[PDB]
A = this chain, B = another copy of it.
Protein backbone atom coordinates (compact mmCIF):
# COMPACT_ATOMS: atom_id res chain seq x y z
CA UNK A 1 0.00 0.00 0.00
CA UNK A 2 3.09 2.15 0.81
CA UNK A 3 3.00 5.00 3.36
CA UNK A 4 1.87 8.47 2.23
CA UNK A 5 2.44 11.80 4.00
CA UNK A 6 -0.33 13.49 5.96
CA UNK A 7 -0.84 17.20 5.44
CA UNK A 8 -3.88 17.62 7.71
CA UNK A 9 -1.78 19.54 10.29
CA UNK A 10 0.00 21.79 7.74
CA UNK A 11 -2.41 22.25 4.81
CA UNK A 12 -5.80 21.05 6.11
CA UNK A 13 -8.92 20.75 4.02
CA UNK A 14 -11.22 22.36 2.98
CA UNK A 15 -9.31 23.88 0.05
CA UNK A 16 -10.72 27.07 -1.47
CA UNK A 17 -11.90 26.51 -5.03
CA UNK A 18 -12.88 29.07 -7.64
CA UNK A 19 -16.27 28.92 -9.36
CA UNK A 20 -14.95 28.61 -12.90
CA UNK A 21 -14.11 24.90 -12.88
CA UNK A 22 -16.86 23.79 -15.26
CA UNK A 23 -16.53 26.62 -17.83
CA UNK A 24 -12.72 26.26 -17.86
CA UNK A 25 -13.15 22.56 -18.66
CA UNK A 26 -15.32 23.32 -21.69
CA UNK A 27 -13.38 26.32 -23.03
CA UNK A 28 -10.26 24.13 -22.69
CA UNK A 29 -11.85 21.46 -24.88
CA UNK A 30 -12.68 24.18 -27.43
CA UNK A 31 -9.05 25.31 -27.54
CA UNK A 32 -7.76 21.74 -28.03
CA UNK A 33 -9.76 21.20 -31.26
CA UNK A 34 -7.65 23.86 -33.01
CA UNK A 35 -4.37 22.28 -31.85
CA UNK A 36 -4.35 18.55 -31.00
CA UNK A 37 -1.82 17.95 -28.23
CA UNK A 38 -2.86 14.68 -26.64
CA UNK A 39 -2.90 11.50 -28.76
CA UNK A 40 -6.02 9.94 -27.17
CA UNK A 41 -9.48 11.27 -26.37
CA UNK A 42 -9.72 9.83 -22.85
CA UNK A 43 -6.21 11.08 -22.17
CA UNK A 44 -7.55 14.46 -23.30
CA UNK A 45 -10.75 14.21 -21.26
CA UNK A 46 -9.11 13.20 -17.99
CA UNK A 47 -6.32 15.79 -18.28
CA UNK A 48 -8.66 18.68 -19.12
CA UNK A 49 -10.82 17.75 -16.15
CA UNK A 50 -8.05 17.56 -13.54
CA UNK A 51 -6.33 20.64 -14.96
CA UNK A 52 -9.55 22.66 -14.66
CA UNK A 53 -10.50 21.58 -11.15
CA UNK A 54 -6.85 21.73 -10.14
CA UNK A 55 -6.55 25.17 -11.74
CA UNK A 56 -9.51 26.26 -9.60
CA UNK A 57 -7.66 25.38 -6.37
CA UNK A 58 -4.35 26.87 -7.58
CA UNK A 59 -5.89 30.34 -8.14
CA UNK A 60 -9.38 30.42 -6.60
CA UNK A 61 -9.56 34.24 -6.75
CA UNK A 62 -8.90 33.52 -10.46
CA UNK A 63 -10.69 35.38 -13.26
CA UNK A 64 -12.38 33.12 -15.79
CA UNK A 65 -10.31 34.38 -18.72
CA UNK A 66 -7.10 34.29 -16.70
CA UNK A 67 -7.60 30.82 -15.19
CA UNK A 68 -8.22 29.48 -18.69
CA UNK A 69 -4.94 31.03 -19.88
CA UNK A 70 -3.04 29.46 -16.96
CA UNK A 71 -4.79 26.12 -17.45
CA UNK A 72 -3.84 26.16 -21.12
CA UNK A 73 -0.20 26.77 -20.19
CA UNK A 74 -0.14 24.10 -17.49
CA UNK A 75 -1.83 21.63 -19.86
CA UNK A 76 0.50 22.45 -22.75
CA UNK A 77 3.41 21.85 -20.35
CA UNK A 78 1.96 18.59 -18.96
CA UNK A 79 1.12 17.35 -22.48
CA UNK A 80 4.62 18.10 -23.76
CA UNK A 81 6.14 16.13 -20.88
CA UNK A 82 3.82 13.15 -21.35
CA UNK A 83 4.37 13.12 -25.12
CA UNK A 84 8.05 13.93 -25.80
CA UNK A 85 9.52 13.38 -22.30
CA UNK A 86 8.58 9.97 -20.95
CA UNK A 87 9.05 6.29 -21.63
CA UNK A 88 12.00 4.21 -20.51
CA UNK A 89 14.43 6.21 -22.64
CA UNK A 90 14.98 3.56 -25.30
CA UNK A 91 16.18 5.41 -28.37
CA UNK A 92 17.56 8.02 -25.99
CA UNK A 93 17.07 11.74 -25.29
CA UNK A 94 18.02 13.20 -28.69
CA UNK A 95 14.39 13.39 -29.87
CA UNK A 96 13.40 15.36 -26.78
CA UNK A 97 16.47 17.59 -27.21
CA UNK A 98 15.29 18.42 -30.74
CA UNK A 99 11.80 19.26 -29.45
CA UNK A 100 13.16 21.37 -26.58
CA UNK A 101 15.37 23.30 -29.03
CA UNK A 102 12.37 24.15 -31.23
CA UNK A 103 10.72 25.52 -28.10
CA UNK A 104 13.84 27.50 -27.15
CA UNK A 105 13.63 29.19 -30.54
CA UNK A 106 10.05 30.26 -29.73
CA UNK A 107 11.09 31.57 -26.32
CA UNK A 108 13.96 33.47 -27.95
CA UNK A 109 11.30 35.09 -30.21
CA UNK A 110 11.52 36.20 -33.81
CA UNK A 111 9.49 33.43 -35.57
CA UNK A 112 11.81 30.39 -35.93
CA UNK A 113 11.34 27.91 -38.80
CA UNK A 114 8.13 25.93 -38.75
CA UNK A 115 7.98 22.58 -36.95
CA UNK A 116 5.73 19.58 -37.61
CA UNK A 117 5.07 19.31 -33.87
CA UNK A 118 2.13 21.49 -32.73
CA UNK A 119 3.82 22.39 -29.42
CA UNK A 120 5.88 25.38 -30.67
CA UNK A 121 2.83 27.07 -32.25
CA UNK A 122 0.70 26.80 -29.11
CA UNK A 123 3.56 28.01 -26.92
CA UNK A 124 4.02 30.99 -29.25
CA UNK A 125 0.38 32.01 -28.74
CA UNK A 126 0.44 31.34 -24.99
CA UNK A 127 3.53 33.53 -24.61
CA UNK A 128 1.88 36.27 -26.70
CA UNK A 129 -1.22 36.32 -24.50
CA UNK A 130 0.89 36.26 -21.34
CA UNK A 131 3.10 39.00 -22.76
CA UNK A 132 0.12 41.35 -23.09
CA UNK A 133 -1.40 40.59 -19.70
CA UNK A 134 1.95 40.80 -17.88
CA UNK A 135 4.39 43.47 -17.00
CA UNK A 136 7.60 43.11 -18.91
CA UNK A 137 9.76 41.82 -16.05
CA UNK A 138 6.95 39.44 -15.02
CA UNK A 139 6.84 38.17 -18.58
CA UNK A 140 10.55 37.32 -18.82
CA UNK A 141 10.56 35.63 -15.43
CA UNK A 142 7.75 33.41 -16.72
CA UNK A 143 9.69 32.76 -19.94
CA UNK A 144 12.82 31.98 -17.91
CA UNK A 145 11.08 29.32 -15.77
CA UNK A 146 9.95 27.62 -18.99
CA UNK A 147 13.56 27.68 -20.25
CA UNK A 148 14.78 26.05 -17.02
CA UNK A 149 12.02 23.44 -17.05
CA UNK A 150 13.02 22.40 -20.56
CA UNK A 151 16.68 21.99 -19.55
CA UNK A 152 15.65 19.98 -16.47
CA UNK A 153 13.41 17.70 -18.55
CA UNK A 154 16.40 17.23 -20.86
CA UNK A 155 18.59 16.43 -17.84
CA UNK A 156 16.08 13.83 -16.58
CA UNK A 157 16.01 12.08 -19.96
CA UNK A 158 19.79 11.71 -19.94
CA UNK A 159 19.46 9.83 -16.64
CA UNK A 160 16.19 7.83 -16.84
CA UNK A 161 18.12 4.77 -18.04
CA UNK A 162 20.31 4.86 -14.89
CA UNK A 163 18.47 6.64 -12.04
CA UNK A 164 20.97 5.28 -9.52
CA UNK A 165 23.69 7.39 -11.18
CA UNK A 166 21.99 10.61 -9.97
CA UNK A 167 23.04 12.37 -6.78
CA UNK A 168 20.18 12.97 -4.35
CA UNK A 169 21.26 16.58 -3.85
CA UNK A 170 21.19 17.14 -7.61
CA UNK A 171 17.75 15.56 -7.93
CA UNK A 172 16.47 17.75 -5.10
CA UNK A 173 17.76 20.85 -6.93
CA UNK A 174 16.47 19.82 -10.39
CA UNK A 175 13.05 18.41 -9.46
CA UNK A 176 11.35 21.81 -8.79
CA UNK A 177 11.86 22.55 -12.50
CA UNK A 178 10.22 19.31 -13.74
CA UNK A 179 7.23 19.60 -11.38
CA UNK A 180 6.59 23.06 -13.00
CA UNK A 181 6.37 24.95 -9.70
CA UNK A 182 8.34 27.98 -10.88
CA UNK A 183 6.15 28.50 -13.95
CA UNK A 184 3.02 28.21 -11.80
CA UNK A 185 4.42 30.77 -9.36
CA UNK A 186 5.51 33.16 -12.15
CA UNK A 187 2.13 32.87 -13.89
CA UNK A 188 0.58 33.44 -10.48
CA UNK A 189 2.20 36.84 -10.05
CA UNK A 190 0.88 37.85 -13.47
CA UNK A 191 -2.69 36.65 -12.93
CA UNK A 192 -2.88 37.78 -9.27
CA UNK A 193 -1.52 41.24 -10.08
CA UNK A 194 1.48 41.43 -7.78
CA UNK A 195 5.20 41.42 -8.36
CA UNK A 196 8.24 41.25 -6.12
CA UNK A 197 11.32 43.42 -6.59
CA UNK A 198 14.71 41.74 -6.87
CA UNK A 199 15.53 42.77 -3.29
CA UNK A 200 12.32 41.12 -2.04
CA UNK A 201 13.14 37.96 -4.01
CA UNK A 202 16.52 37.79 -2.25
CA UNK A 203 14.88 37.89 1.21
CA UNK A 204 15.69 34.68 3.07
CA UNK A 205 12.01 34.63 4.08
CA UNK A 206 10.91 34.46 0.44
CA UNK A 207 13.64 32.03 -0.70
CA UNK A 208 13.09 29.60 2.16
CA UNK A 209 9.33 29.39 1.64
CA UNK A 210 9.86 28.97 -2.11
CA UNK A 211 12.39 26.19 -1.49
CA UNK A 212 10.01 24.44 0.95
CA UNK A 213 7.04 24.65 -1.43
CA UNK A 214 9.14 23.43 -4.37
CA UNK A 215 10.39 20.50 -2.33
CA UNK A 216 6.86 19.61 -1.18
CA UNK A 217 5.43 19.79 -4.70
CA UNK A 218 8.04 17.57 -6.34
CA UNK A 219 8.18 15.05 -3.51
CA UNK A 220 4.43 14.48 -3.09
CA UNK A 221 4.25 14.07 -6.86
CA UNK A 222 7.02 11.46 -6.68
CA UNK A 223 5.22 9.51 -3.95
CA UNK A 224 1.74 9.77 -5.50
CA UNK A 225 3.01 8.41 -8.82
CA UNK A 226 5.59 5.84 -7.69
CA UNK A 227 3.37 2.75 -7.53
CA UNK A 228 1.70 3.83 -10.76
CA UNK A 229 4.97 4.22 -12.70
CA UNK A 230 6.72 1.11 -11.45
CA UNK A 231 3.87 -1.35 -12.16
CA UNK A 232 4.22 0.15 -15.67
CA UNK A 233 6.97 -2.46 -16.12
CA UNK A 234 10.25 -0.76 -17.01
CA UNK A 235 12.46 0.11 -14.07
CA UNK A 236 12.60 2.07 -10.86
CA UNK A 237 11.63 5.69 -11.69
CA UNK A 238 13.95 8.66 -11.31
CA UNK A 239 12.19 9.97 -8.21
CA UNK A 240 12.75 10.53 -4.50
CA UNK A 241 12.00 7.00 -3.14
CA UNK A 242 14.39 5.44 -5.67
CA UNK A 243 17.32 7.64 -4.68
CA UNK A 244 16.67 7.22 -0.97
CA UNK A 245 16.51 3.44 -1.58
CA UNK A 246 19.93 3.48 -3.26
CA UNK A 247 21.38 5.69 -0.48
CA UNK A 248 20.34 3.75 2.58
CA UNK A 249 19.43 0.29 1.36
CA UNK A 250 16.50 -1.15 3.23
CA UNK A 251 13.20 -1.73 1.44
CA UNK A 252 11.13 0.43 -0.87
CA UNK A 253 8.62 0.63 2.00
CA UNK A 254 11.35 2.04 4.24
CA UNK A 255 12.20 4.60 1.55
CA UNK A 256 8.55 5.70 1.42
CA UNK A 257 8.40 6.21 5.18
CA UNK A 258 11.40 8.54 5.32
CA UNK A 259 10.15 10.33 2.19
CA UNK A 260 6.76 10.75 3.90
CA UNK A 261 8.53 12.07 6.97
CA UNK A 262 10.55 14.40 4.75
CA UNK A 263 7.38 15.83 3.20
CA UNK A 264 5.69 16.44 6.57
CA UNK A 265 8.78 18.21 7.90
CA UNK A 266 8.92 20.19 4.65
CA UNK A 267 5.19 20.97 4.88
CA UNK A 268 5.76 22.25 8.42
CA UNK A 269 8.55 24.55 7.20
CA UNK A 270 6.32 25.91 4.43
CA UNK A 271 3.53 26.63 6.93
CA UNK A 272 5.85 28.51 9.27
CA UNK A 273 7.12 30.39 6.23
CA UNK A 274 3.60 31.32 5.13
CA UNK A 275 2.85 32.60 8.64
CA UNK A 276 6.13 34.53 8.90
CA UNK A 277 5.59 36.13 5.46
CA UNK A 278 1.87 36.90 5.93
CA UNK A 279 2.97 39.19 8.79
CA UNK A 280 4.91 41.27 6.26
CA UNK A 281 3.86 44.88 5.90
CA UNK A 282 4.23 45.11 2.06
CA UNK A 283 1.22 43.87 0.13
CA UNK A 284 3.47 42.11 -2.38
CA UNK A 285 5.10 39.86 0.23
CA UNK A 286 1.80 39.04 1.91
CA UNK A 287 0.22 38.36 -1.48
CA UNK A 288 3.13 36.06 -2.39
CA UNK A 289 2.76 34.03 0.82
CA UNK A 290 -0.97 33.63 0.19
CA UNK A 291 -0.43 32.75 -3.48
CA UNK A 292 2.09 30.06 -2.53
CA UNK A 293 -0.32 28.73 0.09
CA UNK A 294 -3.00 28.07 -2.57
CA UNK A 295 -0.51 26.70 -5.12
CA UNK A 296 0.60 24.17 -2.49
CA UNK A 297 -2.94 23.33 -1.35
CA UNK A 298 -3.64 22.47 -4.98
CA UNK A 299 -0.58 20.21 -5.33
CA UNK A 300 -1.80 18.32 -2.26
CA UNK A 301 -5.30 18.19 -3.72
CA UNK A 302 -4.09 16.63 -7.02
CA UNK A 303 -2.76 13.69 -4.95
CA UNK A 304 -6.29 13.09 -3.59
CA UNK A 305 -8.42 13.79 -6.68
Q: Which chain A residues in 136-182 approach chain B with CB under 8 Å?
A: 136-137, 139-141, 143-145, 147-148, 150-152, 154-155, 158-159, 169-170, 172-174, 177, 182
Any chain B CB within 8 A of the CB of A105? yes
Given A144-B147, A154-B154, the answer on whether A174 and B207 have CB atoms closer than 8 Å is no
A202: which B residues are within 8 A, CB to CB? 109
Any chain B CB within 8 A of the CB of A104? yes
Any chain B CB within 8 A of the CB of A35? no
Given A140-B141, A170-B113, A198-B136, the answer on whether A148 and B147 have CB atoms closer than 8 Å is yes
Closest Cβ–Cβ distance, residue A50 to chain B (whole Å): 27
| Chain A positions 95 through 119: 1 when the CB is less than 8 Å from some CB of chain B, otherwise 0 | 0011011001101111011000000
Give Cα A234–Cα B137 distance, bound, in whole angstroms: 44
| Chain A positions 180 through 215: 1 when the CB is less than 8 Å from some CB of chain B, otherwise 0 | 001000000000000000100110000100110000
A112: which B residues are within 8 A, CB to CB? 173
Closest Cβ–Cβ distance, residue A182 to chain B (whole Å): 7
B177 lies within 8 A of A97 (CB)? no
Which chain B residue has the least Cβ–Cβ distance from A150?
A: B151
Given A140-B137, A144-B140, A158-B97, the answer on whether A173 and B207 have CB atoms closer than 8 Å is no
| Chain A positions 77 through 99: 1 when the CB is less than 8 Å from some CB of chain B, otherwise 0 | 00000000000000001100110
Any chain B CB within 8 A of the CB of A302? no
A169: which B residues are within 8 A, CB to CB? 113
A151 lies within 8 A of B155 (CB)? no
A108 lies within 8 A of B177 (CB)? yes
Give Cα A182–Cα B107 distance, bound, in whole angstroms: 13
A159: which B residues are within 8 A, CB to CB? 94
A101 lies within 8 A of B151 (CB)? yes
B97 lies within 8 A of A148 (CB)? no
Q: Which chain A residues in 118-134 approach chain B with CB under 8 Å?
A: 131
Could you list some 24 contacts between A and B, CB below 8 A? Answer: A93-B94, A97-B155, A98-B158, A100-B151, A101-B152, A101-B154, A101-B155, A101-B170, A104-B148, A104-B151, A104-B177, A105-B174, A109-B201, A110-B173, A110-B211, A113-B169, A137-B137, A139-B198, A144-B144, A147-B147, A147-B151, A151-B151, A151-B154, A154-B154
